[PDB]
Ligand binder design. Structure first.
Ligand SMILES: [Mn+2]
Ligand SMILES: [Mn+2]
Ligand SMILES: [Mn+2]
Ligand SMILES: [Mn+2]
Ligand SMILES: [Mn+2]
Ligand SMILES: [Mn+2]
Ligand SMILES: [Mn+2]
Ligand SMILES: [Mn+2]
Lengths: 393, 393, 393, 393
């Protein structure tokens, strides 16, 4: 263990600051001061802090209040050395955003939400953030006839392209990252998975500066393989930021510590972030952000306990993931299974679809029954990863 | 009821021909002859029939067997008037495809699978099919370390772009449609949802002729809103074909009749296919294909019963969906809820991000607390759709 | 369809009183005065109202306040004629209840919780309720080492048997109804399904007055069939109360209007409540209670609309379900599928095990392959049901 | 970690004998000779073998054939010393069983099924098994009107009580173990979870010799916590046998190696099997049986590897789980979180309901807000568990 600032562990203000109100109860913790949040995070080993506009500045704050709050906030950053790598907007708590922000059926709410985002783009740039996250938590419905589904996507595109266009126009060194979620708070959220988010960016005018912010728990709420999904984001060159946490199953968004959900998936998530791909390719080099919530049953000792535990978890998995790939029996197990063979092109250099046209050598004289005997040995390969994870090897 | 060929009800050979072997048992029905399948379908009102290569021609058939089978097959088509709108390949039953076709770790299997597809592209063109479907049922894994996830997508791209390139090269009037599935038979299938499939096409060299073939049951196995997902496919101009069936929940692929799963979702699926969008936009005009399986407990009377029931179900939902949108109280309910208001651009013609920059009129002097009082009346709107569906209105 | 007090539709105070606060946002509606809840529901057709101690009487209420409130509420009830058939305790909203009431790790909290329940049994008795519901929403854990699981069930048992002992002792006409929920707010809730609730009752010293209160959306949060789950409850004669609502898949507890979730499942629950079992058996006679939440997007006109939609939905389903069983065609199809043959005992009167093994016709010379030919025609009976549901018959 | 017969690892014949046929494909492995299964497992460390009547003796086997096979199998057993601790019946693969065995709609099938079970009780008794498992995989429906649900449970009861009657009558040392499964092959299976299995047993005339056989992946197919579900089974003293495997979410029954699914859940099951309850209580003493399937991608070297991986996984988890509870730090954290306080009865010796309501300290003057301040520190106890699991402690 022992996290240091080069690890790039970033935490949201709303994570440690989450006081415990869930849908069946009131907060169980006293509010956490932001200056206090910054000091504690810096002392634990964090590299940066992120926030939602209304996490720092009340929705109601006056210009005088806004400047007082930013001054103490900015002094704390200064005193500690924490960076502010990502900033986001709250388009979900105020009753006004009850049918959404960008895709609200009410046109005046659409403008209001877009206006709130544009101003937040100015604060992001002022803080030195490199990523602007968008979580469209109220964009969706409970009922299928509540929306014109083509119009909802046109309205989503207008919002995202106006904000991008504005970044480009002002020359901020900022990228937008959309954060998919399948449901909750809405019955169905638009762009519910990594796939949907990625396809959607391809339809934008300014897609070049738009990417994703996948969250472990969120793909797991649809039953999807998180490593598979980030792999696809990474492969497309659109993995701009990431939110790490735990989810045990398809149920409400739990936001547990990273590693306190699906442990084997978390191991393979850390191998992809740290080690990248077996055959070489793209690498994710941004910050490792923890979007979780300290369990409501625990007091403030639990809150600082949970923040350290996320970092701990990631460094213990990282250590076993480095030893796993380094292991000569694993490397040989991988060669047997065809992990490196998958890296070879199917077609020979210069071969055409008519040339191969299945060639036979690859079609007519192929022994399918003999090729089928191959022992891929995937089970033995999986056993090697579990033993490495368990600290056994 | 009373389906007629202008309805464009197409059925797969494997649907009525499915004999009942599941994972816990043997077939409960005698094999169904293809010529017999064509006569029965034509007499029930179908417009066309689709098949997988090995549905008609055994994997082992000789050239002499292949031409005998196509001759009787082609005569039946002739005798009845059925079209052959879609053709697909079996890259999943033979033991050789145990780690996949296009993304097999074994390079020689990759070539073999690609060769089988290329030849099948020639048969598709020969049958007059306009769509070539690809269901990558064995592309995936049980274990996360079994594959190099960037390489698996590169290998998937190579296969799809070689087949497209070949279509283009031969001038066939054919489009490729990928069919997403989240799991089963693999623990995790690559391109598991509509979103993933749509993003993936954006990375291809020949994406222009590649689109999707969403299946009701398959998005519902991830817990997703099927209407939401096809809306997104339609909005992107990539809804090339569709597979309609029933699924009750997240479990194994049931392939029940259309309407025998999530009934309210099926109603809204039929409103989108038939009515399109409230404010106007794109429309799906291809065939309505039924990819289901007659319950194993039923004999052949059940098989012809189930085929008619799919058509019946779609025409009863169609009828209630036309009456629902035509209803002046529904139209007024929609106007109250802001369904048409969602269709208006957020920004005024000529307004810039700095102009609006939230304007206030839309930011600073906005009454958020007053805009929040609005009664969207989505519940009353949902009640109007259920009453129309129930035949009450 | 107009509900009458005779229909026995009950509503909770917390249902139409739900203010809109969820985990991602604040209330969107003003608090509801209890007096008005009562009067409004009385004009809609309700038979009665139900409450949680703290929905009516604030946690911190002084004695003068409590008497006032009860005077006001008892007044409204006398004015309108509304019955109060069920009363329940709030053991989940105050921070003290973060680890549970009955199964909290802290013993003083366990005692407070039980004291809190006993006093509420007195109130329930004063109010004329017949049923006392226990929903243990905070009983469970997020993590597997947090609880000694055998001790969690002894503690659960000790509180439920103490409550029941007290009823018996006091001579009150109250029966306890346990209400299962698999998750939310806890990660895992003790006694998560109807099955676990029924099992637990059998280990109770006073299980004769302890039964179930199954909720539609709760069983669907684990993907079970609600109609099968309440059928087991009935069969064991333990179906004391029922909570009707709607859920649209495995996710957060939506609490949508009855019939606004899984529609065909809603139709079959109503057929079971209304027609009982095809071969005869016990019948459910209690209140038809709705525990739903008016979507937060809707203002007060939506609240009364939603309340009304519950009773409308139920009556429309009832009309269809009665027409379904009354149909000669449906009866014939039920005979053919063996719905009535299931009711015939398998053995012959006084036929023992030995006699069966020894009957040659039954085993040794049974023609398995011939028997397997029966066409159960379950698809066609299902189609008939849906056709009645859609009112096309 | 080397398994010894003392470990009591049992395997089914159908497990390592699984040939690879799934719903989308044919077998990828040759059939396994039973003699070799037995010898191979004996050399790996197995304690015993288990089978389904038809895994060993073909459905259609003549008497000479059956005797031969039994002679061969009994030979191998004498040679190796393998015990046969559990025997079960195949009521799901032949087409006659399409609607179930015990709850088939057809009465002659119900009789055949019961005859088939009785004869298998004789064999089981001859083989020395202590447990007779019933997995009712075809008992259920795809559609809600297919069954009279109260009659489905009477028929279920009649077959299980007849089987148990027969055991008692014959003086056999056999106990019946019911095995739940929520779905697959049927859309909905009767008695879907541990909870429903335990509830049903209580309605049986001979429920004293009828208990449960929970399977890890089965409880996870409904998203329940396996460790909670077997804890209820134990608490009721009804945990007669257990099936260990792995499942990676809500989907088809994967039957992966124990520990190859949800890893932290596997660790806590092992802690419960090995350490029992923190405060004491009953302990599970039967066989540790694995009901898994070697992935079809793997040849025979993979089959024995997978068999071995099950015992390895279990022993490695056991080592960690024992080190976990033996740790002073872990014991201290368990004390602080109230794991031992849960074991203290809530009331005082001879304290009644009345006395509790009346104790002022407990209710009237209880300081709720003070009590709510306790830091349960469940996150830190969870972190300690994972750290032991990862062998970093
Ligand atoms: Mn989240
Ligand atoms: Mn997030
Ligand atoms: Mn399917
Ligand atoms: Mn399909
Ligand atoms: Mn609920
Ligand atoms: Mn309820
Ligand atoms: Mn299984
Ligand atoms: Mn099993």
């Amino acid at each position: 263990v022992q996290p240091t600032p080069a690890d790039h562990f970033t935490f949201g203000l709303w994570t440690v600051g989450w006081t415990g109100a869930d849908p069946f109860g009131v907060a169980t913790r006293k509010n956490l001061d932001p200056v206090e949040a910054v000091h504690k995070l810096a002392e634990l080993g964090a590299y940066g802090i992120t926030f939602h506009d209304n996490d720092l500045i009340p929705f109601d704050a006056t210009e005088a209040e806004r400047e007082k709050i930013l001054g103490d906030f900015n002094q704390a950053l200064k005193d500690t050395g924490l960076k502010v790598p990502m900033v986001t907007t709250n388009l979900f708590s105020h009753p006004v955003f009850k049918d959404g922000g960008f895709t609200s059926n009410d046109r005046s709410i659409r403008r209001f939400a877009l206006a709130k985002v544009l101003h937040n783009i100015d604060l992001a740039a002022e803080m030195g953030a490199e990523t602007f996250v968008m979580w469209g938590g109220r964009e969706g419905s409970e009922y299928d006839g509540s929306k014109d589904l083509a119009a909802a996507l046109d309205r989503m595109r207008e919002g995202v392209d106006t904000a991008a266009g504005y970044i480009k126009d002002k020359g901020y060194n900022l990228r937008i990252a959309l954060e998919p979620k399948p449901n909750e708070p809405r019955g169905d959220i638009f762009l519910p998975t990594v796939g949907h988010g990625l396809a959607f960016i391809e339809q934008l005018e300014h897609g070049d500066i738009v990417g994703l912010n996948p969250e472990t728990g969120h793909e797991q709420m649809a039953g999807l393989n998180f490593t598979h999904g980030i792999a696809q984001a990474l492969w497309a060159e659109k993995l701009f930021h990431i939110d790490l946490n735990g989810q045990r199953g398809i149920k409400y968004d739990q936001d547990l510590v990273f590693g306190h959900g699906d442990l084997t998936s978390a191991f393979f998530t850390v191998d992809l972030l740290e080690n990248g791909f077996p055959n070489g390719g793209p690498k994710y080099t941004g910050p490792r952000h923890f979007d979780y919530k300290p369990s409501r049953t625990d007091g403030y000792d639990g809150v600082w306990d949970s923040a350290k535990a996320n970092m701990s978890m990631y460094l213990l998995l990282k250590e076993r993931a480095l030893a796993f790939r380094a292991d000569p029996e694993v490397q040989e197990a991988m060669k047997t299974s065809g992990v490196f063979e998958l890296g070879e092109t199917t077609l020979n250099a210069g071969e055409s679809a008519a040339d191969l046209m299945n060639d036979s050598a690859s079609f007519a004289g192929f022994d399918a029954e003999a090729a089928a005997e191959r022992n891929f040995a995937f089970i033995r390969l999986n056993q090697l990863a579990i033993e490495h994870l368990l600290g056994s090897r």
